[PDB]
Every structure is written in structure tokens, then in C-alpha cells.
Amino acid sequence: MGRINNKIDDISLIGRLLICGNSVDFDIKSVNKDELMISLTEFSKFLHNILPSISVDIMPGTNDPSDKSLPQQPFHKSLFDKSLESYFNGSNKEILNLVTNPYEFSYNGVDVLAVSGKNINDICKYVIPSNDDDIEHRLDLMECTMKWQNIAPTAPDTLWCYPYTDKDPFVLDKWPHVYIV
């Protein structure tokens, strides 16, 4: 909000914020509606304080209240405070945009792809007895994923049934400028 740094000349350059995933964390085994509602209302406050100053981009994750597979739909129109109904009117979309887990944002002509990170986390969930959890290893895995033109290398652990018909979406068709994981 520019209240801490006080350098408005530099803080005003942040056009929008991008929440990539994991905003609410619980164990789906033992949870009730009250805890999720409390966490969503706690998030709603923060949201109501940040919205009228800087735009926001909401993305789901692996521990978010959405589908566990990779192509997660947006959360819902519900699950937020009733005071946010002015933003969910369908007209003010540039201020708050709830998008799927993978997305290719064209920010002023710059194509950037963002993913919740379930693909890399599932690839690292195996133990391959070759190829000789550091930063360089994740970078090399991301580079290999970008070169192979396949966002999801492990089909059954990541992908779900009926993803598409005759044209998979996870196979890369156009290379982006920045790959955000």
C-alpha cells in the first residue's frame, strides 16, 4: 500500500499482485465448514484492504479447496465475504481475476505461464535410480519440462480423467517469455 516504504515513486510500479496458490492449508481428512469459513473470512479482510489499491490475480493450488488434479477450475463465486459482491458483479474483472491453476498471462504483450507447482512436486515425489532436492535440480527439471514441451510428464499422478479430446492442453504449442512455478 506504500505506507511502509513511503517511496511512492517506486511502489506505484507494482500494477497487480499474483497469488499463485496455497492460500488456505488444511487436512481434508478432518475439517469442518467452520474452519474453512473462518480462514476464508480472514483472507477476505486482507482482500478488502488490498483490492482498492492494487489489482490481484488469484490462482488455486494443491492444498486449496478445489480439485486435486492439475487443471483446477477457479474456486467459486461463493466462499468469500458478502462485502465482496461489488467485485463479483462480472464488470470489475481487471481489479480481481480468479483464473485456473495453469494460465498464460499476456501482461502488456508479455506472455508468462504460471503453474501451482504440482507437476514439479509430483516429479520430485519419485526416486529415480539414475541421473547421478537442491535449487539447481529444480531448475534443471523445469528446463527439461520446458524443452520437452510437456507440462505434465507424469500422467496418472498429476492428470485426471478426460482432460481433452484429440488435443491435449498440457502439450506446449507456443513458448512463453517467463515460466513461473
Partner: protein, 197 residues
């Protein structure tokens, strides 16, 4: 009685929890800062995670709320075990209880009262383990317990059994006073007190 029951319940729960935690009557490792204990709590209070203490306090608060129709004072005592002497006394007044809205305001008042209680408890010296225990005392207007078993109380459901076990679990009995802030809201007119030495 429609909504003040749950509010008074969670208030007494947070009261007992903070009293048990800040006086070192139980190990702090068994307590965790939470906000949901089957009821939305107005503040991140340290609540215990032990089964026996859980339903113990639950039944205590249930009996207190059932007897509220004639109780005007609720006290939590803290006594030593080497000598049966009262060391600390925390009083909660219920003057007419404003008996027979804006839940956020009730939660704010409860939060202010709990903050005042925590500020008062933070000034007390450290309390040691090894049998520094607590008790419970109440003050009613006009009631008599321990005499409902004069007809063998033939039970038929759970309500009668609960009433009997609540009316039979009470036994009759016989410094620097520091006042705190209570709840000045309409329906819940509650006052707070404290005693030492």
C-alpha cells in the same frame, strides 16, 4: 437464552482456559493457540488438547449455564495441595444477567475483557508446578442441591440423568481486590473481579 447461551459458553471456556494456562496449573506444551474448538472463538486463545479436561470443562460450563437462572456469581479458585488454603480467587459477576444482536460487538467486548485479564495475569509472579491446583465455587440466589435423590429418580431419558448428575455433583461450603472491565453490552451485562493473597 436463544443466542446468549453459546456466547456465555465460549466466554466461560476462554476464561477457564486462560486461567489454567497463565497460572501454570497444566503444562503449556499441552496448550496450543487456536481459534476453533467446536465454536468460533473471538481471539487466538491457548486451549488445551486433552480429552478428559475437554469434557470436564464442558460439563462444568453446561452445569453453570443451566444453573445461571439462579446463580449471580461464579468464582474459580486456585489453591495449594500441601495445605487446603485459597491462594487466588477470580470472580465473575452476573448481576441480574440482563435476563429475559451484532455478534461482532459481543466478540469485541469479550476480546477486550480477555485482554484485560491477560494484562492482569502478566503482572503476577511465576507459578510453579507440582500440585498447585484449582477449584470451583459458585454463589446462587435461592437453590438447594443434593436432595433430588429422595425418590430414587427413576430415569427415562438422558435429560433426567443429566439433571440428576448435575444436582448431585455439588456440595455445600462456607488481600488485594483488583477490578477489571466486563461486558457493557445490552444482553450480556457481565462484570469482572479478582483477588490475591
Amino acid at each position: 437464552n436463544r443466542w446468549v447461551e453459546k456466547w456465555l459458553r465460549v466466554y466461560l471456556k476462554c476464561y477457564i482456559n486462560l486461567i489454567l494456562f497463565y497460572r501454570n496449573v497444566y503444562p503449556p506444551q499441552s496448550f496450543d493457540y487456536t481459534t476453533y474448538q467446536s465454536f468460533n472463538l473471538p481471539q487466538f486463545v491457548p486451549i488445551n488438547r486433552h480429552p478428559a479436561l475437554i469434557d470436564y470443562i464442558e460439563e462444568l460450563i453446561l452445569d453453570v449455564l443451566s444453573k445461571l437462572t439462579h446463580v449471580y456469581r461464579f468464582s474459580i479458585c486456585i489453591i495449594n495441595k500441601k495445605n487446603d488454603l485459597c491462594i487466588e480467587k477470580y470472580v465473575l459477576d452476573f448481576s441480574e444477567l440482563q435476563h429475559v444482536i451484532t455478534e461482532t460487538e459481543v466478540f469485541d467486548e469479550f476480546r477486550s475483557s480477555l485482554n484485560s485479564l491477560i494484562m492482569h495475569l502478566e503482572k503476577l509472579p511465576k507459578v510453579n508446578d507440582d500440585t498447585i491446583t484449582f477449584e470451583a465455587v459458585i454463589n446462587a440466589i435461592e437453590l438447594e442441591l443434593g436432595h433430588k435423590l429422595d425418590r430414587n429418580r427413576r430415569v427415562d431419558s438422558l435429560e433426567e440423568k443429566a439433571e440428576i448428575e448435575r444436582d448431585s455433583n455439588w456440595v455445600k461450603c462456607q488481600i488485594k481486590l483488583t477490578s477489571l472491565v466486563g461486558s457493557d453490552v445490552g444482553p450480556l451485562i457481565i462484570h469482572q473481579f479478582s483477588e490475591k493473597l
